[PDB]
Amino acid sequence: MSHHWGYGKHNGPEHWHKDFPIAKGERQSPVDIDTHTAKYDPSLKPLSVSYDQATSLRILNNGHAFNVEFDDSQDKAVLKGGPLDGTYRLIQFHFHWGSLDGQGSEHTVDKKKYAAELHLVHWNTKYGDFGKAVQQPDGLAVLGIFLKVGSAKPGLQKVVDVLDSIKTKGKSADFTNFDPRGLLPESLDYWTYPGSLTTPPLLECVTWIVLKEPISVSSEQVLKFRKLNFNGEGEPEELMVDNWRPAQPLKNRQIKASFK
């Protein structure tokens, strides 16, 4: 209730460390993925994304992005395999995007910034609840997917069309029966490394799994994202754009590739 961080000049990423010292920690995210340095790891098991039973409930503008929330009270949509030990339950997804097509993603690939990045957030069921999971080094598994501007992503349109109803911070709308399988690329090849939440509290509880294949969305689709507001209703309008944290020091970490 007293947080004041954001993405502006005075409360942006370079200021976060004052209230969240872990911002200068040993396993912060995002990071630049150097494709030539990432090493193929034969020990990685096949990745398993099981979203057939996913049941979405609502979409919320929280002042820094919009979250499509899922009912995680039962074992439905789960992520397992790959570098993960155990089962991780889908709780929400959201995006980070830019003011221009040349920027917006959090992770970068050989310093390349994509127009946006989708984060599907899952928590380790062995910890019982999300709140407990974020206090553990292996509490969350976040599937990151890059977005590039080109052809439209049909499966994203239902999200785009509901944004008019959650323009400002604090607004929410019912959002049932949305199938997240429609946001996945063809290939599940990925890079993985141990990291953190990319927004305060920046907790170091995430196993990051970043897909190599981006999905394509249309210019009209991302333009709608850019009409959202960081501000609440009846406040000076500040477009919700460039809500991404830049790449952080890799420090003592190795990025592993699931392929080639």
User: Which listed residue (33, 54, 121, 156) binds ligand FK8 by CB under 6 A?
Assistant: 121
64 is catalytic: yes
DSSP state of 12: S
Instruction: Report yes or no: 38 and 110 within 8 Å, Cβ to Cβ.
Output: no
Q: Which does 142 bind (CB under 5 to 8 A by kind): ligand FK8, Zn ion, none?
A: ligand FK8
How many residues bind ligand FK8 (CB under 6 A)? The answer is 7
**Binding of ligand FK8 by 156 (CB under 6 A):** no
Count the Cβ atoms, other than its own, within 10 Å of residue 217: 26
**Which residue out of 15, 64, 107, 122 is catalytically annotated?**
64
Token pair belonging to 140: 């969350």
HEC string of 103-141 equals CCCCCEECCECCCEEEEEEEEEHHHCCHHHHCCCCCCEE
- Binding marks (x or -) toward ligand FK8, 195..214, rule CB under 6 A? --xxx---------------
Residues sharing a CB contact under 8 Å with residue 59, sequence separation 6 or more, in sequence order: 66, 67, 68, 69, 159, 162, 166, 172, 173, 175
**Binding of ligand FK8 by 119 (CB under 6 A):** yes
> 142 vs 149, which CB is nearer to ligand FK8?
142
Q: How far is the CB of 14 from ligand FK8 (least distance, A)?
A: 17
**Binding of Zn ion by 119 (CB under 5 A):** yes
CA gap 114, 148 in Å, rounded = 6
Residues assigned a catalytic role:
64
Annotated binding site for Zn(2+): 94, 96, 119
Give the residues lining the site for Zn ion (CB under 5 A): 119
